[PDB]
Design an enzyme around this catalytic site. Structure first.
Site, PDB file in Angstrom:
ATOM      1  N   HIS A 150       0.794  -1.217   0.000  1.00  0.00           N
ATOM      2  CA  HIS A 150       0.000   0.000   0.000  1.00  0.00           C
ATOM      3  C   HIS A 150       0.830   1.271   0.000  1.00  0.00           C
ATOM      4  O   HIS A 150       0.252   2.353   0.112  1.00  0.00           O
ATOM      5  CB  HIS A 150      -0.941   0.042   1.217  1.00  0.00           C
ATOM      6  CG  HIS A 150      -2.087  -0.917   1.147  1.00  0.00           C
ATOM      7  ND1 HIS A 150      -3.047  -0.861   0.163  1.00  0.00           N
ATOM      8  CD2 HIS A 150      -2.431  -1.951   1.948  1.00  0.00           C
ATOM      9  CE1 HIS A 150      -3.925  -1.828   0.353  1.00  0.00           C
ATOM     10  NE2 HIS A 150      -3.572  -2.506   1.428  1.00  0.00           N
TER      11      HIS A 150
HETATM   12 ZN    ZN Z   1      -5.051  -5.817   3.283  1.00  0.00          ZN
END
Ligand code: ZN
Ligand code: K
Ligand code: K
Lengths: 393, 51
Positions: A150
């Site tokens: 992320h």
């Molecule tokens: Zn995740």
């Protein structure tokens, strides 16, 4: 273009055997985000324990990889970001109040003691796995401390601070034309997709949950810009999806990608917030359902690089990672856990099982038919021109 | 009855009369059990450290 079927017993095929290189570093478990944070590196350590005590270390080779250097981090990140990571400590945060505001630091991604060292371990393991895969030594390369998918080129996002998968694929691309990335977290693999969006040499394929969720991206109509158009596959799904459903969606997408894109190096994120009982995810996957993905991606026969990801109930990530690692060695384990130093955490019957619940499946044969037809349509502009002699990938 | 009751009382305060010998083969089992559990704990722990 989807018919639902029952979920078949996961079973290792004997015609192919691998040379697994497993990467572990006895330091990694020793870092902690803070008091109540859902991210606990300790679970990697826990998985190691089972690998030792099941007798599974005796068919693979376990290595510590050297930590990644600042200038190997700046192949994808900026200098200001990495310099901030290197200089910030829980004690002097008051003198970085601008940068913390500016690099997305403070509540969802705090600064703990050992942040830079933890990041070094993750990145090092990923890049050394990739390099050893390039040198023709190993076939599979496992690194459960990496998979922080992320993270942004200039920003900390969603428990992640450094995108080690980007560095790994950059090292894999020095010798390979076309690299596939599969992401079976419950969140969207948005850092890697944002990083390789306008290219055709990395094909990203996410299977995520789209809704009032995190991060908020990855629709069915987000398929790449520029020369990277049709080189970004999203499969948005709804709550409650279980093993049979997931397997019948997951297999044909991957098989069509393999027939068309013809990639010849796969990276596989094996996040564990997509299991039943997780504290942030909302799927209803078993351990066999979550491991059949690994078994299928392995049944093709091209260099795989398996990495970690999510998983916020430690017990379940530990058990499914140990089971997957046993499956990469052509070994279906036994259900009774051996005595180990974590012979707690495994109430109430101390077995190698992840149990699903009875919550309801909000995904039905028409939504999935529509999604998979749109995808099969998007996924035919991604072949190789007829005069281009290959190396049998 | 004074003779009988105090004869049994001072024949029992040594530990020989039936009632105190019906609770002593019922508690030695509990202690033996706890000790067996301790031994098994150590056995598993040491054979784990080994491997
Ligand atoms: Zn995740
Ligand atoms: K995903
Ligand atoms: K791409």
């Amino acid at each position: 273009v989807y018919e639902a079927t029952p979920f078949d017993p996961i079973t290792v095929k004997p015609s192919d055997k691998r040379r697994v290189a497993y990467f572990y570093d006895a330091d990694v478990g020793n870092y902690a985000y803070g008091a109540g944070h859902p991210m606990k590196p300790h679970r990697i350590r826990m998985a190691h324990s089972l690998i030792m005590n099941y007798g599974l270390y005796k068919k693979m080779e376990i290595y510590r990889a050297k930590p990644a250097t600042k200038q190997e981090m700046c192949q994808f990140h900026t200098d200001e970001y990495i310099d901030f990571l290197s200089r910030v400590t829980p004690d002097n945060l008051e003198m970085f109040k601008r940068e913390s505001v500016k690099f997305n630091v403070g509540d969802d991604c705090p600064v703990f003691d050992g942040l830079y060292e933890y990041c070094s371990i993750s990145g090092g393991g990923s890049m050394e796995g990739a390099a050893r895969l390039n040198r023709g030594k190993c076939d599979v390369a496992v690194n459960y401390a990496g998979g922080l998918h992320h993270a942004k080129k200039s920003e900390a996002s969603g428990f992640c601070y450094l995108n080690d998968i980007v560095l790994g694929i950059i090292e894999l691309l020095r010798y390979h034309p076309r690299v596939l990335y599969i992401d079976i977290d419950v969140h969207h693999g948005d850092g890697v997709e944002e990083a390789f969006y306008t290219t055709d040499r990395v094909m990203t394929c996410s299977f995520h949950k789209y809704g009032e969720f995190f991060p908020g991206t990855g629709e069915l109509r987000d398929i790449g810009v520029g020369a990277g158009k049709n080189y970004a596959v999203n499969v948005p799904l709804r709550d409650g999806i279980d093993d049979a459903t997931y397997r019948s969606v997951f297999e044909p997408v991957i098989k069509k990608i393999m027939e068309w894109y013809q990639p010849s190096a796969v990276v596989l994120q094996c996040g564990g917030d997509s299991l039943s009982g997780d504290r942030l995810g909302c799927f209803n996957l078993s351990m066999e359902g979550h491991a059949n993905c690994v078994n299928y991606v392995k049944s093709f026969g091209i260099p795989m690089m398996v990495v970690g990801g999510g998983g916020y109930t430690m017990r379940n990530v530990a058990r499914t990672w140990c089971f997957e690692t046993g499956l990469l060695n052509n070994v279906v384990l036994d259900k009774d856990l051996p005595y180990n130093e974590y012979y707690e955490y495994y109430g109430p019957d101390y077995k190698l099982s992840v149990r699903p619940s009875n919550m309801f499946n909000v995904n039905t044969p028409e939504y999935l038919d529509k999604v998979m037809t749109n995808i099969f349509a998007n996924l035919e502009n991604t072949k190789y021109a007829p005069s281009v002699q290959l190396n049998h990938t | 009855q004074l003779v009988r009751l105090q004869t049994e009382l001072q024949m029992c305060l040594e530990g020989s009369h039936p009632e105190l010998q019906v609770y002593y083969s019922k508690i030695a089992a509990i202690r033996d059990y706890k000790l067996h559990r301790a031994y098994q704990r150590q056995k598993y722990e040491l054979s784990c450290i080994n491997t």
